[PDB]
Coordinates of C-alpha atoms (C1' of nucleotides) and ligand atoms in Angstrom, one line a residue:
Chain X
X10 CA 79.4 112.9 54.2
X11 CA 82.6 114.9 54.3
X12 CA 86.1 113.6 54.6
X13 CA 86.4 115.3 58.0
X14 CA 83.2 113.6 59.2
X15 CA 84.1 110.0 58.1
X16 CA 87.7 110.3 59.5
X17 CA 87.0 112.3 62.7
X18 CA 89.7 114.8 61.8
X19 CA 88.9 117.3 64.6
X20 CA 91.9 118.7 66.4
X21 CA 92.1 119.4 70.1
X22 CA 92.4 123.1 71.0
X23 CA 95.8 123.9 72.4
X24 CA 94.5 125.1 75.7
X25 CA 92.4 122.0 76.2
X26 CA 95.3 119.9 75.2
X27 CA 97.4 121.6 77.9
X28 CA 94.8 120.8 80.5
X29 CA 94.9 117.1 79.6
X30 CA 98.7 117.1 79.6
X31 CA 99.0 118.7 83.1
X32 CA 96.7 116.1 84.6
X33 CA 98.5 113.2 82.9
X34 CA 101.9 114.3 84.2
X35 CA 100.5 115.0 87.7
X36 CA 98.9 111.5 87.8
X37 CA 102.0 109.9 86.4
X38 CA 103.9 107.9 89.2
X39 CA 106.7 106.6 87.0
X40 CA 110.4 107.0 87.5
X41 CA 110.9 110.1 85.3
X42 CA 114.7 109.5 85.5
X43 CA 114.8 108.1 81.9
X44 CA 113.0 108.7 78.6
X45 CA 109.2 108.4 79.1
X46 CA 107.5 107.0 76.0
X47 CA 104.4 108.9 75.0
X48 CA 101.9 107.7 72.4
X49 CA 99.1 109.4 70.4
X50 CA 97.4 106.7 68.3
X51 CA 95.6 109.4 66.2
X52 CA 98.0 112.3 66.4
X53 CA 96.5 114.5 63.7
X54 CA 98.8 117.5 63.3
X55 CA 100.5 116.7 66.6
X56 CA 98.7 119.1 69.0
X57 CA 98.6 116.6 72.0
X58 CA 102.3 115.5 71.6
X59 CA 103.3 119.2 71.6
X60 CA 101.1 120.0 74.6
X61 CA 102.5 117.2 76.7
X62 CA 106.1 117.9 75.7
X63 CA 105.7 121.5 76.6
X64 CA 104.5 120.6 80.1
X65 CA 107.2 118.0 80.5
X66 CA 110.0 120.4 79.6
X67 CA 108.9 122.6 82.4
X68 CA 109.5 119.6 84.7
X69 CA 112.9 118.8 83.3
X70 CA 111.4 115.5 82.0
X71 CA 112.6 114.0 78.7
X72 CA 109.9 112.4 76.4
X73 CA 109.9 110.1 73.4
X74 CA 107.0 111.2 71.3
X75 CA 105.2 108.7 69.1
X76 CA 102.3 109.6 66.9
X77 CA 100.2 107.5 64.5
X78 CA 97.7 108.7 61.8
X79 CA 96.4 107.0 58.7
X80 CA 96.3 110.3 56.8
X81 CA 99.6 111.3 55.2
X82 CA 98.7 115.0 55.1
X83 CA 98.2 114.9 58.9
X84 CA 101.5 113.0 59.2
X85 CA 103.3 115.6 57.0
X86 CA 102.0 118.6 58.9
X87 CA 102.7 117.0 62.3
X88 CA 106.3 116.3 61.3
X89 CA 106.7 119.9 60.3
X90 CA 105.3 121.2 63.6
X91 CA 107.3 118.8 65.7
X92 CA 110.6 119.4 63.8
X93 CA 110.2 123.2 64.2
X94 CA 109.5 122.9 67.9
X95 CA 113.1 121.9 68.5
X96 CA 112.4 118.5 70.0
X97 CA 114.5 115.7 68.5
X98 CA 113.2 112.5 70.0
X99 CA 109.9 112.0 68.1
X100 CA 108.6 109.4 65.6
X101 CA 105.6 109.4 63.3
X102 CA 104.0 106.4 61.6
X103 CA 101.5 106.6 58.7
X104 CA 99.2 103.6 59.2
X105 CA 95.8 102.5 60.4
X106 CA 96.3 102.2 64.1
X107 CA 93.6 99.6 64.3
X108 CA 95.4 97.5 61.6
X109 CA 92.3 96.3 59.7
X124 CA 105.9 98.6 68.4
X125 CA 107.1 98.6 72.0
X126 CA 104.5 99.4 74.7
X127 CA 104.6 103.0 76.0
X128 CA 104.4 104.6 79.4
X129 CA 101.9 107.4 78.7
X130 CA 99.0 107.8 76.2
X131 CA 97.5 111.1 75.4
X132 CA 94.7 110.8 72.8
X133 CA 91.7 112.3 71.1
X134 CA 90.6 109.5 68.8
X135 CA 88.2 110.0 65.9
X136 CA 84.5 109.7 66.6
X137 CA 82.6 108.0 63.8
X138 CA 79.1 106.7 64.3
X139 CA 78.0 103.3 63.2
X140 CA 76.0 104.6 60.2
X141 CA 79.1 106.3 58.8
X142 CA 81.4 103.2 59.4
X143 CA 78.8 101.1 57.5
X144 CA 77.3 97.9 58.9
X145 CA 80.1 95.8 57.4
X146 CA 83.1 97.6 59.0
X147 CA 81.2 98.0 62.3
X148 CA 80.9 94.2 62.5
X149 CA 84.7 93.8 62.1
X150 CA 85.4 96.3 64.9
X151 CA 83.0 94.5 67.2
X152 CA 84.7 91.1 66.6
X153 CA 88.2 92.4 66.8
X154 CA 87.9 94.5 70.0
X155 CA 85.1 92.6 71.8
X156 CA 82.5 95.4 71.5
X157 CA 78.7 95.4 71.4
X158 CA 75.9 97.6 70.1
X159 CA 76.1 100.6 67.8
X160 CA 79.8 100.8 68.1
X161 CA 81.7 104.0 67.5
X162 CA 85.2 104.3 66.1
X163 CA 86.4 105.9 69.4
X164 CA 85.3 102.8 71.3
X165 CA 87.6 100.6 69.1
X166 CA 90.4 103.1 69.6
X167 CA 90.0 102.9 73.4
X168 CA 90.5 99.1 73.3
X169 CA 93.3 99.3 70.7
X170 CA 95.3 102.0 72.5
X171 CA 94.9 100.4 75.9
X172 CA 96.8 97.3 74.9
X173 CA 99.7 99.5 73.7
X174 CA 100.1 100.9 77.3
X175 CA 102.3 99.2 79.8
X176 CA 100.9 98.2 83.2
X177 CA 100.8 101.2 85.7
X178 CA 101.0 103.5 82.7
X179 CA 98.8 106.6 82.6
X180 CA 96.2 107.3 79.9
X181 CA 94.5 110.6 79.3
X182 CA 92.0 110.4 76.5
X183 CA 89.1 112.7 75.5
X184 CA 86.2 111.1 73.6
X185 CA 82.5 111.7 73.2
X186 CA 80.9 111.4 76.6
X187 CA 78.1 109.2 75.3
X188 CA 79.7 105.9 76.5
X189 CA 78.8 107.1 80.0
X190 CA 75.0 107.1 79.6
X191 CA 74.0 105.1 76.5
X192 CA 73.1 101.4 76.2
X193 CA 75.8 101.0 73.6
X194 CA 78.5 102.3 75.9
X195 CA 78.2 99.2 78.1
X196 CA 81.2 97.4 76.4
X197 CA 83.3 100.6 76.9
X198 CA 82.4 101.0 80.5
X199 CA 83.1 97.4 81.3
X200 CA 86.4 97.5 79.4
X201 CA 87.5 100.7 81.2
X202 CA 86.7 99.7 84.7
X203 CA 88.3 96.2 84.3
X204 CA 91.5 97.5 82.7
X205 CA 92.3 100.7 84.6
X206 CA 92.4 102.1 88.1
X207 CA 90.1 105.0 87.2
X208 CA 91.6 108.2 88.4
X209 CA 89.2 110.9 87.1
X210 CA 86.4 111.2 84.5
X211 CA 85.7 114.8 83.3
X212 CA 82.3 115.3 81.7
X213 CA 82.8 118.5 79.7
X214 CA 79.1 118.6 79.0
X215 CA 77.9 121.4 76.7
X216 CA 80.9 123.7 77.2
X217 CA 81.5 123.5 73.4
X218 CA 85.3 123.4 73.4
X219 CA 85.3 121.9 69.9
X220 CA 83.7 123.6 66.8
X221 CA 81.9 120.3 66.4
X222 CA 78.5 119.7 68.0
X223 CA 79.6 117.2 70.6
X224 CA 79.6 116.8 74.4
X225 CA 83.1 115.2 75.3
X226 CA 84.5 113.4 78.3
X227 CA 88.1 113.0 79.4
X228 CA 89.2 109.7 81.0
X229 CA 92.3 109.4 83.2
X230 CA 93.4 106.0 84.4
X231 CA 96.3 103.9 85.4
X232 CA 96.4 100.5 83.6
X233 CA 96.0 97.6 86.0
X234 CA 98.9 95.4 86.9
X235 CA 97.0 92.0 87.2
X236 CA 99.4 91.3 90.1
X242 CA 93.6 101.4 97.1
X243 CA 92.1 104.1 95.0
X244 CA 88.7 105.9 94.8
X245 CA 87.9 107.3 91.3
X246 CA 86.6 110.9 91.2
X247 CA 84.8 112.9 88.6
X248 CA 84.5 116.4 87.3
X249 CA 81.3 117.6 85.7
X250 CA 80.6 120.9 84.0
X251 CA 77.5 122.0 82.1
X252 CA 76.0 125.4 81.3
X253 CA 73.4 126.3 83.9
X254 CA 70.5 128.3 82.3
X255 CA 68.3 128.6 85.4
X256 CA 70.0 130.2 88.4
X257 CA 67.6 130.0 91.4
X258 CA 67.3 133.0 93.6
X259 CA 69.3 131.8 96.6
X260 CA 72.3 130.5 94.5
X261 CA 75.5 132.5 94.3
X262 CA 77.9 132.6 91.4
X263 CA 81.7 132.8 91.3
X264 CA 83.1 135.1 88.6
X265 CA 86.8 135.4 89.6
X266 CA 87.7 133.3 86.6
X267 CA 88.2 135.0 83.3
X268 CA 88.3 132.0 80.9
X269 CA 86.3 128.8 80.4
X270 CA 89.6 126.8 80.3
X271 CA 90.4 128.0 83.8
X272 CA 87.2 126.4 85.2
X273 CA 88.6 123.0 84.4
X274 CA 91.0 123.3 87.4
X275 CA 88.3 124.5 89.9
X276 CA 88.2 122.2 92.9
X277 CA 85.0 123.3 94.5
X278 CA 81.5 122.6 93.4
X279 CA 79.2 125.5 92.6
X280 CA 78.1 127.9 90.0
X281 CA 80.8 129.7 88.0
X282 CA 80.4 132.4 85.3
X283 CA 82.9 133.1 82.6
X284 CA 80.6 136.0 81.7
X285 CA 78.2 135.5 78.8
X286 CA 77.5 132.1 80.4
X287 CA 77.1 130.5 83.8
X288 CA 78.3 127.0 84.5
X289 CA 77.4 124.4 87.1
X290 CA 80.5 122.5 88.2
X291 CA 80.3 119.3 90.3
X292 CA 83.1 117.3 91.8
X293 CA 82.8 114.0 93.6
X294 CA 83.4 110.2 93.4
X295 CA 81.9 107.9 90.8
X296 CA 80.0 105.3 92.7
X297 CA 80.8 101.6 92.0
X298 CA 81.6 101.8 88.2
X299 CA 81.8 98.0 88.2
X300 CA 78.0 98.1 87.7
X301 CA 78.7 98.9 84.1
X302 CA 75.3 97.7 82.7
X303 CA 73.7 100.8 84.0
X304 CA 74.8 104.3 83.0
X305 CA 77.6 105.7 85.1
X306 CA 76.2 108.4 87.3
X307 CA 78.2 111.6 88.0
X308 CA 76.4 113.0 91.0
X309 CA 77.4 114.6 94.3
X310 CA 77.0 112.9 97.7
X311 CA 73.7 114.6 98.4
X312 CA 72.3 114.0 94.9
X313 CA 73.3 110.3 95.1
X314 CA 71.8 109.8 98.5
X315 CA 68.5 111.4 97.5
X316 CA 68.6 109.2 94.4
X317 CA 69.1 106.0 96.4
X318 CA 66.4 106.9 98.9
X319 CA 63.8 107.3 96.1
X320 CA 64.8 103.8 94.8
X321 CA 64.4 102.2 98.2
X322 CA 61.0 103.8 98.9
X323 CA 59.8 103.1 95.3
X324 CA 57.0 100.7 94.8
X325 CA 58.1 99.9 91.3
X326 CA 59.0 101.3 87.9
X327 CA 57.2 102.3 84.7
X328 CA 58.6 99.2 83.0
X329 CA 56.5 97.1 85.4
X330 CA 53.3 98.8 84.5
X331 CA 53.4 100.0 80.9
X332 CA 54.9 99.6 77.4
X333 CA 57.1 102.6 76.6
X334 CA 57.1 102.5 72.8
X335 CA 58.6 104.7 70.2
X336 CA 56.5 106.2 67.4
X337 CA 56.5 105.0 63.9
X338 CA 59.9 105.0 62.1
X339 CA 59.0 105.8 58.6
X340 CA 62.5 106.2 57.0
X341 CA 60.9 108.6 54.5
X342 CA 59.2 111.3 56.5
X343 CA 58.7 113.8 53.7
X344 CA 56.9 111.1 51.7
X345 CA 54.6 109.4 54.2
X346 CA 53.9 112.3 56.7
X347 CA 52.4 115.4 55.2
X348 CA 49.8 118.0 55.8
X349 CA 49.1 119.0 52.2
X350 CA 47.3 115.8 51.1
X351 CA 44.4 117.8 49.8
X352 CA 46.3 120.0 47.4
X353 CA 47.7 117.0 45.5
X354 CA 46.8 115.8 42.0
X355 CA 43.4 114.2 42.2
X356 CA 45.0 111.0 40.8
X357 CA 47.5 110.9 43.7
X358 CA 45.4 111.9 46.7
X359 CA 45.6 108.7 48.9
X360 CA 42.3 107.1 50.0
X361 CA 41.0 108.5 53.2
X362 CA 41.3 105.0 54.8
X363 CA 45.1 105.3 54.6
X364 CA 45.4 108.9 55.9
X365 CA 45.6 108.6 59.7
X366 CA 46.1 111.7 61.9
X367 CA 49.5 111.7 63.5
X368 CA 50.9 113.7 66.4
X369 CA 54.4 115.1 66.3
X370 CA 56.7 116.6 68.9
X371 CA 56.0 120.2 68.0
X372 CA 52.4 119.7 69.2
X373 CA 53.4 118.4 72.6
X374 CA 52.3 120.0 75.9
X375 CA 51.5 118.9 79.4
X376 CA 48.5 116.6 79.9
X377 CA 46.7 118.0 76.9
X378 CA 47.6 118.3 73.2
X379 CA 47.4 121.6 71.2
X382 CA 43.9 118.4 64.8
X383 CA 46.3 120.2 62.4
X384 CA 45.7 118.5 59.0
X385 CA 48.9 116.4 59.6
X386 CA 48.2 112.8 58.5
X387 CA 50.4 109.8 57.7
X388 CA 50.0 107.4 54.8
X389 CA 49.7 104.2 56.8
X390 CA 50.8 101.3 54.7
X391 CA 49.9 98.4 57.1
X392 CA 46.7 96.8 58.3
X393 CA 45.3 93.8 60.1
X394 CA 44.3 91.1 57.5
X395 CA 43.7 87.5 58.7
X396 CA 44.6 88.2 62.3
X397 CA 48.1 89.3 61.2
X398 CA 49.9 92.5 60.6
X399 CA 50.4 92.8 56.8
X400 CA 51.3 95.5 54.4
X401 CA 48.5 96.9 52.2
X402 CA 48.0 95.9 48.6
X403 CA 48.7 98.7 46.2
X404 CA 46.3 97.3 43.6
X405 CA 43.5 97.9 46.2
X406 CA 44.2 101.6 46.6
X407 CA 44.8 103.1 43.2
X408 CA 45.2 106.7 44.2
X409 CA 47.7 105.8 46.9
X410 CA 49.5 103.5 44.5
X411 CA 50.2 106.2 41.9
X412 CA 51.5 108.5 44.6
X413 CA 54.0 106.0 46.0
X414 CA 55.0 105.2 42.4
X415 CA 56.3 108.7 42.2
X416 CA 58.8 108.3 45.0
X417 CA 59.7 104.7 44.1
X418 CA 63.4 105.6 43.5
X419 CA 63.9 107.0 47.0
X420 CA 61.7 104.2 48.6
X421 CA 63.3 101.3 46.7
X422 CA 66.8 102.6 47.4
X423 CA 66.4 101.7 51.1
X424 CA 68.5 98.6 51.0
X425 CA 67.4 97.4 54.5
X426 CA 63.8 97.3 53.4
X427 CA 64.4 94.8 50.6
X428 CA 66.8 92.7 52.7
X429 CA 64.0 91.8 55.1
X430 CA 61.8 90.7 52.1
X431 CA 59.5 93.6 52.6
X432 CA 57.8 95.8 50.0
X433 CA 59.5 98.9 48.7
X434 CA 56.5 101.1 49.6
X435 CA 56.2 100.2 53.3
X436 CA 56.7 102.2 56.4
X437 CA 59.9 100.7 58.0
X438 CA 58.5 100.5 61.5
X439 CA 54.7 100.7 61.4
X440 CA 54.2 99.0 64.8
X441 CA 50.8 97.4 65.5
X442 CA 48.0 99.1 63.6
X443 CA 45.5 97.9 66.2
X444 CA 47.3 99.6 69.2
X445 CA 46.7 103.2 68.1
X446 CA 43.0 103.0 69.2
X447 CA 43.9 102.5 72.9
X448 CA 44.3 105.5 75.1
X449 CA 48.0 106.5 75.6
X450 CA 50.5 108.9 77.0
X451 CA 52.5 110.8 74.4
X452 CA 55.7 112.7 75.0
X453 CA 58.6 114.1 72.9
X454 CA 62.0 112.6 72.9
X455 CA 64.2 115.8 72.6
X456 CA 62.9 118.3 75.1
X457 CA 64.2 120.5 77.9
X458 CA 61.0 119.9 80.0
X459 CA 58.8 116.8 80.4
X460 CA 55.7 117.2 78.1
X461 CA 53.7 114.0 78.8
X462 CA 50.0 114.3 77.7
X463 CA 47.0 112.0 77.5
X464 CA 45.4 111.1 74.2
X465 CA 42.3 108.9 73.5
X466 CA 41.4 109.8 70.0
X467 CA 43.3 107.0 68.3
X468 CA 46.0 109.0 66.4
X469 CA 49.4 107.7 65.2
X470 CA 52.6 108.8 67.0
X471 CA 55.4 110.3 65.0
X472 CA 59.0 109.0 65.3
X473 CA 60.2 112.0 67.3
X474 CA 57.8 111.0 70.1
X475 CA 57.4 108.0 72.3
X476 CA 54.1 106.7 73.7
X477 CA 52.9 104.8 76.8
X478 CA 50.1 102.2 76.9
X479 CA 49.4 100.1 80.1
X480 CA 50.6 96.5 80.3
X481 CA 47.4 95.9 82.4
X482 CA 44.4 96.1 80.0
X483 CA 42.9 98.9 82.1
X484 CA 44.2 102.3 81.2
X485 CA 42.1 103.9 84.0
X486 CA 44.2 105.5 86.8
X487 CA 47.5 103.9 85.9
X488 CA 48.4 106.2 83.0
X489 CA 47.3 109.2 85.0
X490 CA 49.6 108.3 87.8
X491 CA 52.5 107.8 85.4
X492 CA 51.7 111.1 83.7
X493 CA 51.8 113.1 87.0
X494 CA 55.1 111.5 87.9
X495 CA 56.7 112.0 84.5
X496 CA 55.8 115.7 84.3
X497 CA 56.9 116.5 87.8
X498 CA 60.0 118.5 88.8
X499 CA 60.5 115.6 91.2
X500 CA 61.2 113.3 88.2
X501 CA 63.2 115.9 86.4
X502 CA 65.5 116.0 89.4
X503 CA 65.6 112.2 89.3
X504 CA 66.3 112.2 85.6
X505 CA 69.2 114.7 85.7
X506 CA 70.9 112.4 88.3
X507 CA 70.2 109.0 86.9
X508 CA 70.1 109.6 83.1
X509 CA 72.7 112.3 82.2
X510 CA 72.4 112.1 78.4
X511 CA 72.0 115.8 77.3
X512 CA 72.1 117.4 73.9
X513 CA 72.9 121.1 73.5
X514 CA 70.6 123.7 75.1
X515 CA 69.7 121.5 78.1
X516 CA 67.7 119.0 76.0
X517 CA 67.0 115.7 77.8
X518 CA 66.5 112.4 76.0
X519 CA 63.2 110.9 77.0
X520 CA 63.9 107.4 75.6
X521 CA 62.5 104.0 76.4
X522 CA 65.7 102.9 78.1
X523 CA 65.4 105.9 80.6
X524 CA 61.6 106.2 81.1
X525 CA 61.4 102.5 81.8
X526 CA 63.5 103.2 84.9
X527 CA 61.3 106.0 86.3
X528 CA 60.2 105.0 89.8
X529 CA 56.5 104.8 90.6
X530 CA 54.8 104.9 94.1
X531 CA 52.1 102.5 95.3
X532 CA 49.1 103.2 93.1
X533 CA 46.8 102.1 96.0
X534 CA 48.3 104.7 98.3
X535 CA 46.0 107.6 99.3
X536 CA 48.6 110.1 98.0
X537 CA 48.8 108.3 94.7
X538 CA 45.0 108.2 94.4
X539 CA 44.8 112.0 94.8
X540 CA 47.5 112.5 92.2
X541 CA 45.3 110.5 89.8
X542 CA 42.3 112.6 90.5
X543 CA 44.3 115.8 90.2
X544 CA 45.8 114.6 86.9
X545 CA 42.3 113.6 85.7
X546 CA 41.2 117.2 86.3
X547 CA 44.1 118.6 84.2
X548 CA 43.2 116.2 81.4
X549 CA 39.4 115.8 81.3
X550 CA 38.5 119.4 82.3
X553 CA 41.7 125.6 83.2
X554 CA 43.3 129.0 83.8
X555 CA 46.7 129.7 85.5
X556 CA 45.5 127.7 88.5
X557 CA 47.1 124.7 86.7
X558 CA 50.2 125.5 88.6
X559 CA 48.2 125.4 91.8
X560 CA 47.4 121.7 91.1
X561 CA 50.9 121.1 89.8
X562 CA 52.5 122.3 93.1
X563 CA 49.9 120.1 94.9
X564 CA 51.1 117.1 92.9
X565 CA 54.7 117.9 93.9
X566 CA 53.9 117.7 97.6
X567 CA 51.8 114.6 97.0
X568 CA 54.7 112.9 95.1
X569 CA 57.1 113.7 98.0
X570 CA 54.6 112.2 100.4
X571 CA 54.2 109.2 98.1
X572 CA 57.9 108.6 98.1
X573 CA 58.3 109.6 101.8
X574 CA 60.8 112.4 101.3
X575 CA 60.8 116.2 101.2
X576 CA 63.2 117.3 98.4
Chain Y
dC1 C1' 59.5 92.3 65.2
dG2 C1' 61.4 97.6 67.7
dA3 C1' 64.2 100.8 70.0
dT4 C1' 68.8 103.3 69.3
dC5 C1' 72.1 107.1 68.3
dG6 C1' 73.8 111.4 66.6
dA7 C1' 82.9 115.4 66.2
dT8 C1' 74.1 116.4 65.8
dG9 C1' 72.6 119.8 61.3
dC10 C1' 70.9 123.2 59.4
Chain C
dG1 C1' 69.7 127.7 68.3
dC2 C1' 66.9 123.7 68.9
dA3 C1' 64.9 119.7 68.0
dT4 C1' 66.7 115.6 63.9
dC5 C1' 65.1 111.2 61.3
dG6 C1' 67.1 107.4 58.9
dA7 C1' 70.5 103.4 58.9
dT8 C1' 71.6 100.4 62.5
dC9 C1' 71.8 96.3 66.3
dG10 C1' 69.6 92.6 68.4
Ligands
SAH601 N1 92.1 104.2 61.5 C1 92.8 105.3 61.8 N2 94.1 105.1 62.2 C2 94.8 106.1 62.6 N3 94.5 107.4 62.7 C3 93.2 107.6 62.3 C4 92.4 106.6 61.9 N4 91.1 107.1 61.5 C5 91.3 108.4 61.8 N5 92.5 108.7 62.2 C6 93.0 110.1 62.5 O1 92.5 110.4 63.8 C7 92.6 111.8 64.0 C8 91.5 112.3 64.9 S1 91.6 114.1 65.2 C9 92.6 114.2 66.7 C10 94.0 114.7 66.3 C11 94.9 115.0 67.5 N6 95.1 113.7 68.3 C12 94.3 116.0 68.4 O2 93.8 115.6 69.5 O3 94.5 117.2 68.1 C13 92.6 112.4 62.6 O4 93.8 113.1 62.3 C14 92.4 111.2 61.7 O5 93.2 111.3 60.5

DNA sequence: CGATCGATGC
DNA sequence: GCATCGATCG
């Protein structure tokens, strides 16, 4: 990994910095008669301190600028830019802000984002114990805790981070810490606007630190809108993307080359931090709540939403060229199982393609055990070739498991059951039925019924999951998006899909219609699809 | 065990 | 400009 990657050295663009500065000073309710202390805990080359001082000078406000950064080169360049700007009252400290100073009145920040795997398992454990965090902790989550305690009560914070704390399971500690330490003023999900050169969807958090001794938090949400429906008008009286960040009306806006969907509203009861924070309008949230009330249950109550095998060496275990190998290394046909990947995914039906996985696990004496390499000589010599890469996986040997094993093989006896398969990263739901007993690749998830009767129940789930109804429910309840409108069909989200009463007459016709799309079509598939949409609306007792 | 997360990664 | 895939947490 690069130095910039491990240190999160990604500067804030000057125009985005100005946006953050203006909101901070408009939200600030301090005295402003004396020197206001401003802190940037990871100041980089000083862009945020310059941006907030520029805005404050236009208000005849005097600031004390304080910036910290553990990189001396960043400190050196920030001192040069601040000194040349003509501002005298500033101070820079070269240190680890986390420390592995008097409290300030304002914090403007864009802390580094470093994922758990780049921090290493050892340092991630220290951050969790020091700042009371859980899960796959990111470096920006630690900085959120560390910088918050440097802020005086009633002080204003304005910090941009990755938006993923809003919607991920691992963001739970951050959401809890934020709502219990701040009077949340505004959360701006910048979505896929791509203000940074880096591939990241950021969010900006504005809040007033609680006093411990009378406010409704609002939100701003902007994402690129790819599909403009016929009856939707677009506003184009804004020339720059940075200008859309001060729009105060929901709707479609186009900084030409792109059209953006902007939503404003209130965040609903963020104190329920264990669920993802939902940024939805009043109408979207009402429709979302009415579905939940009229829901019979959820997929979690009916089926196991499981991820495919996690091999941790895909190029070694998953191939299609098994036949054109040395005859001494062609694995025994018992070990080559057909495996379905995300590039074969479609709706209801799959598109054999010679793609097989070398399955290293089996059922011996009623238990799941790894295979014996002495029993499969041709498969042994093949895995002997890549032993260096396979044995270098430290986590494999720490669990007292063999170097040649698939890391997560799941249960070899469960592949035979009929199942629903769908891809994780996808802009549209592609849930299809499969009863041929093939393995599921790690880029896909798969659904088997909790009840030992796959009849009807998987077909009802499949019709729900593929529907535009559930895509609308997903975009409201589970707002985790990659670039290009790609949803994340993960266990933690699909478990929470609502399901109507499977004994309802509307549900029974969905099952028969879905059974036609699986068992048996020309372009009349959409005729049945639209019929399922109306049946789903009747099953949930709504009409949108 | 088994699902997560990605200043994505080319 | 489009769909990771392997270290990680619990
Ligand atoms: N442990 C640590 N303590 C202090 N600064 C750190 C740090 N780890 C990374 N940083 C710094 O955090 C910065 C993040 S880049 C953001 C820079 C600036 N605030 C801006 O928004 O433009 C980098 O300059 C990096 O050197």
